[PDB]
């Protein structure tokens, strides 16, 4: 009212919302941890042959050591150090995901989710936070869930909303545990504060559409995490309950 | 007494000038932003694309905040490209250092009634949404879930009791926003957290730019103030929640 | 036994010169500011805009502190322009590093009786005012709601308990100030907080720059002392309140 | 339903090569140091002084750790000179960043039977020695009070319960060391403490450089294992005492 | 077994030279200062201003510590100007980097008996004076309220149990000083801060520079030890106080 600027503010408020375009903007700008297609393309293009061989290796590193290439290269066998650093030069691996284009080894593992989670369980005895830590909270925690990549495999279609919620709570057990075990800064945070530090990445993975739900459900059934009826395992239901109970 | 000592004393014998001083106080009192300068800049720069460009900036502020570069690595390709472009185009910055610093949130703050309505329509997208609020109160007004709602609390055409409830109701989200989003506030009391936002909120409320005669109408239309001029039920329960830690 | 050990042994054998020592201690003691240094600089640099300039600088100190650049980003453009102008005009700084360092607050401290009177006149604009204070005690004396008040407590013309009591009342505000305003010292003990301000508070009180015959007269004329030279009701309560954690 | 999506899927559809994988995991597994790399550098560079030089470094590592420069300003003048000489002479560094980095503590780890032997002799000089271990357990084996003892725990020629006990006894010191010395670990949980050394411990216990037959025969000679091949009273009680938080 | 592996094996089958090792350990153990060095530097550099110069330096150390520049900006002009001159004059540093670092406190520690006397005479000027210790203990010995006291604690000329009482009585001031002055030390257990001073204290007490016979005689001349060579009432009380957390 008072100035032309004041009136402009008021009239801008008088407008009517376009709910279809506001939504688009919202999703356009919504959190996103990675573009799996860009990482797979970068990888396959860069290494022609020897890209499946080279990628897997990057995934075992991510699974067992994280993103910290340089510190890690100094604390490993010579051949593993040698190859790791070779692959870093070769793919331009970075230790921190600054932009959409930055290839961290954990982004690599998150981009091939069903291979990673399978490798996780085969290697459960090498994971930084595996059966030891998990088993003393629940009997038989599904080892495929012991990695950053498992959230991409929780489905949102072909299962009940309750099933999807169970899988997230169960998975949160390991998320919360990994964080505490691994993150120095996070030590002493309430259960909610731990949660928030991973709310967004887990959501973006779940509600992502790159890895198709029908493939998820089948994988889940095949691993026993869902029964044939499409509802969680015993172990999942407990892990979920455990997590709801702190 | 040295010559100086004697000056110091004679300086406190002077009569106070209560208008001089008040004027001084207000001129130096914390000020959140110049919305006028912000709107003028966006319009003069954008031409007519400014109205859409703004809405797009406001949605960014609503769901991502101010950290443009960090957030551009964590979105879609369309979002990121458009956002970087709007930044280059308008001179957008991530920190509100000076009065001329155009931050996404300050843009949101300079078009209040749109932002809140957008926030409510985009409520499921907010970093502190109904997921958070509901654990504290059933039916938290979604128009209160954003940084811009502060400008809409009126101080004229409602009682200072109505005003105060709207601010306590609002302080519930201010609290949860801070505690949820920024690490430097872990294990901090309800009086420390309030203090981290005392200054901006009191300045938002007592801003003269966005007029109170519209604030009351808009609140009414949005059911946060009833027709009798008093808060809704959802507000009163929200105030009560905050009053009780 | 040889021969530096001998020098050491023989060194400790000497008789102390208690005066030598006590003078060394006074020279090396904490000192917060040379008020005369301050006032002299202001009066030489600014001519007579100096009396106006100081008030306005003091109001800045009383309501926003020492943070010249951050504050100026967050205030009316009028206030912002005169602040940066006065900074350059007087070489105002943000941190006291040397005795030469002229900060707003030190300026505030160099004209005590004016500062506390304006603190009183502008209670509602203080970052720690009657709001925070009434949650502690009924009627907390407003003149004590600033950094300047310490300089006004008497070490002569009153009983030593009177002095102890004024300082105990004051530490209510001091403690409140720090906790409310220091980002560090958040989960910190009472004495820990007290230790953050003992040395300056003690230095301020024991200062010889501002005469006690004026302090007592002013304190009585403000009612913080009664005519018999003893604390008021609300001062006695404030001490006990500080005493009682 | 995308080119790249279809790639991810059939990718995750591959059979694992459990041997491919086991090998990658081991290659990428945490490795504390390459003792063979270490010995070979000390012996190529040291010629024959190497033995007596190594002994001196191992002694500094045992009693001051790895912080060469800071420690040299706080010791005797001769020991300080000899420190800095051996540093230039062998490229001794303070942090183990690469596999090539030669730290005193690493040097010590590369010769664990000597190191643990000489640690028991130097028990009164150890940062964490018999005073701390006696407030926890009767008769803590002195050979254990060092970073090198982990390598001496065997996985071959003893029961796998023997091994667990030996790791549990040892963790008592390990836990005490980190709490005593690491300013960060202060006020952390027992688990939080165990994690910071779980990895290097398992790598040491599981290394193949220093042979299990020799580890066992040595521990027999030191009575950390009785003739049967099972723990000592002290190991057993020390084990139990670590277990009980 | 093979092949560098075999070197590490035979390296550990080498007999221990306990003469070699004990020497190494002493050369390498913690040392706080060559006080002879310090006195030597001061006498040669200063001729006879040297005696009065040191006295002044020590008063500085006692009441303000080692931070020359920071403190010189918060004292009288007189004291600031003399302090800086002495720093240029003597090459004074604020931090104890190497054995040649002559810090104020290090000067105080080089002339222990003088310092503790000076400390007791200036007890009210000390950063941790009676105000602190008087709450903890009735009549805490003022000579112990400084860093130099530990060199005075005797190891010979008195019983082992007497010594432990002094080290314990003293630690009460040690504990108090560290907690009350170092912020990084806040929120920390008793053992965490004891460790903070354990090495320096041990190094002082066990030093051979200052002869034990003087220590005892001097302790006696102050009533810290009675004529039979035993701790005072104040001594045993303060020790009890310290063992009782």
């Amino acid at each position: 009212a008072m100035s032309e600027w004041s009136r402009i503010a008021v009239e801008f408020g008088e407008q009517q919302l376009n709910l279809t375009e506001l939504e688009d903007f919202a999703r356009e700008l919504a959190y996103e941890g990675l573009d799996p297609a860009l990482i797979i393309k970068k990888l396959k293009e860069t290494g022609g042959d020897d890209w499946v061989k080279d990628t897997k290796f990057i995934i075992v590193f991510a699974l067992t050591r994280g993103n910290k290439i340089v510190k890690a290269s100094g604390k490993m066998s010579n051949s593993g150090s040698k190859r790791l650093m070779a692959l870093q030069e070769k793919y331009g691996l970075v230790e921190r995901a600054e932009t959409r284009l930055s290839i961290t080894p954990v982004r690599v593992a998150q981009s091939l989710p069903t291979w990673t989670c399978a490798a996780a369980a085969a290697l459960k005895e090498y994971l930084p936070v595996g059966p030891a830590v998990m088993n003393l909270k629940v009997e038989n925690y599904p080892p495929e869930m012991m990695c950053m990549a498992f959230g991409s495999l929780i489905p949102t279609a072909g299962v009940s909303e309750a099933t999807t919620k169970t899988l997230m709570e169960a998975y949160s057990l390991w998320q919360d545990a990994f964080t505490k075990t691994i993150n120095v800064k996070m030590r002493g945070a309430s259960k909610t504060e731990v949660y928030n530090s991973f709310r967004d990445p887990l959501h973006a993975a779940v509600n992502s559409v790159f890895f198709p739900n029908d493939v998820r459900v089948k994988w889940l059934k095949a691993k026993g995490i869902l029964g044939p009826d499409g509802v969680p395992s015993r172990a999942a239901e407990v892990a979920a309950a455990a997590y709801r109970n702190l």
Side-chain angles (χ1 to χ4, degrees), chain A:
Chain A
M2 57 198 39
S3 47
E4 46 174 313
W5 313 117
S6 214
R7 277 180 300 100
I8 291 181
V10 174
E11 292 294 309
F12 211 99
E14 285 180 12
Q15 283 186 318
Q16 314 269 351
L17 277 33
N18 177 309
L19 296 169
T20 277
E21 85 175 324
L22 272 184
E23 215 87 4
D24 292 334
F25 294 175
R27 311 193 269 259
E28 259 159 37
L29 291 157
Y31 176 93
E32 156 166 327
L34 58 125
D35 181 354
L38 151 60
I39 289 148
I40 298 169
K41 179 179 150 78
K42 182 56 192 178
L43 283 168
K44 188 206 197 315
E45 281 176 358
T46 302
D49 306 77
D50 299 324
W51 89 267
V52 184
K53 284 189 170 180
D54 288 349
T55 291
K56 289 173 179 163
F57 191 90
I58 291 168
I59 296 193
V60 172
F61 177 83
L63 271 176
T64 63
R65 311 295 296 264
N67 280 338
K68 290 177 175 194
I69 298 187
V70 163
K71 168 127 92 81
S73 46
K75 296 290 204 273
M76 60 179 62
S77 82
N78 179 56
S79 89
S81 191
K82 252 172 45 204
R83 196 186 180 180
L84 175 67
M85 297 292 314
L87 292 178
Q88 179 194 39
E89 188 168 338
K90 181 182 174 173
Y91 296 86
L93 298 184
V94 292
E95 293 185 27
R96 200 184 314 100
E98 275 145 288
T99 76
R100 317 183 73 254
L101 267 82
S102 34
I103 318 301
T104 76
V106 168
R107 267 174 170 185
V108 168
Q110 273 178 303
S111 296
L112 290 326
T114 42
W115 187 94
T116 293
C117 294
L123 286 193
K124 44 178 202 160
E125 61 270 29
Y126 299 81
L127 308 171
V129 173
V133 180
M134 286 317 108
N135 289 344
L136 50 89
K137 301 138 112 76
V138 290
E139 186 165 68
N140 287 328
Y141 185 90
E144 286 88 358
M145 306 192 173
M146 283 156 193
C147 66
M148 286 299 306
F150 179 82
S152 283
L153 302 197
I154 301 183
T156 43
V159 294
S160 6
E161 278 189 7
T163 284
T164 303
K165 177 164 169 60
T166 287
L167 298 175
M168 296 190 71
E169 296 163 340
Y171 184 51
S172 307
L173 197 51
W174 177 93
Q175 273 286 330
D176 150 278
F178 175 85
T179 313
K180 273 171 197 151
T181 296
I182 262 335
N183 208 284
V184 217
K185 305 166 92 190
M186 282 290 163
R187 297 178 189 152
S190 55
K191 176 216 204 161
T192 262
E193 289 170 326
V194 177
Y195 182 74
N196 295 336
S197 77
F198 75 74
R199 62 158 195 109
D200 285 337
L202 174 60
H203 204 254
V206 153
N207 295 101
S208 153
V209 300
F210 171 87
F211 209 90
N213 281 279
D214 63 5
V215 179
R216 299 185 212 182
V217 176
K218 173 184 175 291
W219 196 87
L220 280 189
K221 284 163 181 296
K223 297 303 178 177
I225 289 152
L226 299 182
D229 45 330
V231 309
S233 290
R234 174 162 303 130
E237 284 287 0
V238 177
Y243 188 80
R244 276 182 299 250
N245 296 336
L246 268 43

